[PDB]
Amino acid sequence: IFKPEELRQALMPTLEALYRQDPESLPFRQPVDPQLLGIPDYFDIVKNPMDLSTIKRKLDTGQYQEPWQYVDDVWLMFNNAWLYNRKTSRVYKFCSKLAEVFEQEIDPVMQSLG
Ligand SMILES: Cc1noc(C)c1-c1ccc2c(c1)nc([C@@H]1CCCC(=O)N1c1cccc(C(C)(C)C)c1)n2[C@H]1CC[C@@H](NC(=O)OC(C)(C)C)CC1
Structure with missing residues (x-):
């Protein structure tokens, strides 16, 4: 059973790696805003939105108990x-x-966590 500070120390470097990808990480730094973007179908298509700011906040405040839940959210944002x-x-x-x-x-971080 992991503690949310152990989880943050090990997983947060993987999240910071994403943020450094300038300009690639820019669209992903905050929730998609369909009104701003003029894409009214977005929440019809994307039923579970996710972004880097939400994942960081969940990490920072301990909302992940196991590492695969963090991994799931990151792949949710990509998918x-x-x-x-x-x-x-x-x-x-x-x-x-x-x-x-x-x-x-x-990969290396998951293998040292388990
Ligand atoms: C992901 C995804 N999945 O589906 C969707 C849909 C997204 C998604 C999401 C965001 C998006 C987006 C697509 N296209 C844009 C802009 C909008 C114009 C058109 C365009 O070509 N763009 C663009 C795309 C790629 C790269 C960039 C850079 C590198 C110039 C920045 C721009 N943006 C935000 C729109 C505003 C955001 N700023 C913001 O929110 O400011 C406050 C103050 C926090 C409210 C930053 C980029």
Whole structure:
């Protein structure tokens, strides 16, 4: 049974790795705002929105008990973006860049956590 400070120390470097991907992480730093973006169908398509600010806040305040719940949220944000956006769009290709980065950093940390 993990403690939320153990979880934060080990997983937060993987989250900071995402934030550094400038400009790729910019669309993902805050919730998608469908009104601002003019995309009224977004919450029809994305039933469980997620973004970097929400994951950071959940990490910071201890809302994850096990590491796979953090991993699930990160992949939720990618899958939402791959689902809603066309393959030709910048955010789609941005999402693939951050997903590539993420797999690269999450593997060793998950194996030392377990
Ligand atoms: C993910 C995802 N999944 O589906 C969807 C849908 C998203 C998603 C999400 C956001 C998005 C977005 C797509 N396209 C944009 C803008 C909007 C115009 C069109 C465009 O080409 N863009 C764009 C895309 C890729 C890269 C960038 C940079 C690198 C220039 C920044 C821009 N943005 C925000 C819109 C406003 C955000 N600023 C903000 O919220 O400011 C406050 C003060 C916090 C409210 C920052 C980028």
